[PDB]
Amino acid sequence: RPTFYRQELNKTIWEVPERYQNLSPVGSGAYGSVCAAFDTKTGHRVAVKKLSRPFQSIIHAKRTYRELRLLKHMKHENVIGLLDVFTPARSLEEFNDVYLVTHLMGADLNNIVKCQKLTDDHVQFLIYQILRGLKYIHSADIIHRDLKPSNLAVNEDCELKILDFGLARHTDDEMTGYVATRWYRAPEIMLNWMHYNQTVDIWSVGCIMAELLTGRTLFPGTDHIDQLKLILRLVGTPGAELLKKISSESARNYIQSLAQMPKMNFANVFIGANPLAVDLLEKMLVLDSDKRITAAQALAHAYFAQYHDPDDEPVADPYDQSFESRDLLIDEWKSLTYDEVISFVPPP
Ligand SMILES: N#CCC(=O)Nc1ccc(OC(F)(F)F)cc1
Ligand SMILES: [Cl-]
Ligand SMILES: [Cl-]
Ligand SMILES: [Cl-]
Ligand SMILES: [Cl-]
Ligand SMILES: [Cl-]
Ligand SMILES: [Mg+2]
Numbered sequence: 001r002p003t004f005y006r007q008e009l010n011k012t013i014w015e016v017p018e019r020y021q022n023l024s025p026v027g028s029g030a031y032g033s034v035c036a037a038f039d040t041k042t043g044h045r046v047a048v049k050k051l052s053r054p055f056q057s058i059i060h061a062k063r064t065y066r067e068l069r070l071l072k073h074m075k076h077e078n079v080i081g082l083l084d085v086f087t088p089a090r091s092l093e094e095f096n097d098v099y100l101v102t103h104l105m106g107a108d109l110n111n112i113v114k115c116q117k118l119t120d121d122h123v124q125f126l127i128y129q130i131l132r133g134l135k136y137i138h139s140a141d142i143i144h145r146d147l148k149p150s151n152l153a154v155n156e157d158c159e160l161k162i163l164d165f166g167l168a169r170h171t172d173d174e175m176t177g178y179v180a181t182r183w184y185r186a187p188e189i190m191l192n193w194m195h196y197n198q199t200v201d202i203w204s205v206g207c208i209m210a211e212l213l214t215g216r217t218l219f220p221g222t223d224h225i226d227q228l229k230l231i232l233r234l235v236g237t238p239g240a241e242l243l244k245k246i247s248s249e250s251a252r253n254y255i256q257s258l259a260q261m262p263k264m265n266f267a268n269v270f271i272g273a274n275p276l277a278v279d280l281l282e283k284m285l286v287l288d289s290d291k292r293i294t295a296a297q298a299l300a301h302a303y304f305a306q307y308h309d310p311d312d313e314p315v316a317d318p319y320d321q322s323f324e325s326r327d328l329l330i331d332e333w334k335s336l337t338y339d340e341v342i343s344f345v346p347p348p
Pocket of ligand 4: 088094
């Protein structure tokens with residue numbers, strides 16, 4: 001066990017191993033507070049997150065366990081991984097605080113799209129890396145659920161990492177109105193007409209790729225219904241084949257109230273774009289989610305011929321999510337979390 005030291009920063013007590021130095025606050029959401037630090041064991045600049053009230057309810061305790069299990073599994077060049085996890089507790093009986101350590105991230109894709117002139121070569125490389133990471137994530141039967149530019153870190157060499165997996169933490173108010181939190185969500189989950197599934201992540205990638213090509217949000221709706229109208233104007237209203245497969249009675253009733261619209265010509269929407277980029281966008285932004293291209297299929301599309309290497313696009317180890325259907329007490333979720341903290345083995 002390392003030696004810990006305590007300090008107060010922005011009215012919060014931080015108790016961390018001596019290896020972490022020069023702590024400086026960088027932000028705080030509803031899930032925890034974050035400091036930047038220098039890790040003297042590895043030489044990396046890191047982000048240290050102290051979870052806020054991790055075991056206050058069964059829902060929160062299960063969410064803490066879910067986040068730690070996910071971060072411990074992800075081992076891929078284009079996905080955020082876990083450098084360390086620690087607690088100052090010396091036993092399960094005094095266990096209360098959880099700290100997570102990751103590589104410190106600089107710019108996100110938001111900064112890039114609004115501040116930089118992107119070539120088509122830049123778009124190819126950035127979208128390639130998103131799909132490479134997504135092939136890995138989806139091969140473990142994980143759904144990200146919250147892909148958007150602020151959850152994609154990018155460095156000066158145009159190298160990209162996926163972060164901030166959806167832990168089922170977004171509320172109704174967070175999704176209301178003119179908000180980027182909803183602009184990248186697939187139509188079939190925006191009003192909960194379908195259960196989540198991995199095809200919703202490919203819809204998000206299509207929205208991101210369009211924005212890199214044009215510099216503008218693809219579907220900036222002022223509310224759920226305005227956004228649905230923007231979507232259906234581009235991709236068309238549901239045809240007979242898809243309508244037969246829509247089981248939600250709430251969806252069918254409202255959809256049939258709208259006048260029918262054909263799919264638009266994407267070459268007249270994305271003026272001047274590489275024809276191969278237009279072709280790929282048409283295969284991602286499909287209303288019928290059964291028919292969308294998959295991440296593994298998209299890596300082999302000719303738009304990525306410069307970068308595609310099928311011997312360097314790995315899949316994940318199997319990921320056991322059976323805990324998600326399990327009903328446990330707070331202290332049982334807490335004991336499971338403690339076991340995962342003390343069994344952590346750092347990367348090479
Ligand atoms: N079950 C099943 C399939 C299904 O329900 N798919 C779907 C629903 C709603 C959709 O969105 C919109 F209503 F068409 F806008 C798109 C697809
Ligand atoms: Cl230490
Ligand atoms: Cl990482
Ligand atoms: Cl503790
Ligand atoms: Cl965003
Ligand atoms: Cl597992
Ligand atoms: Mg985020």
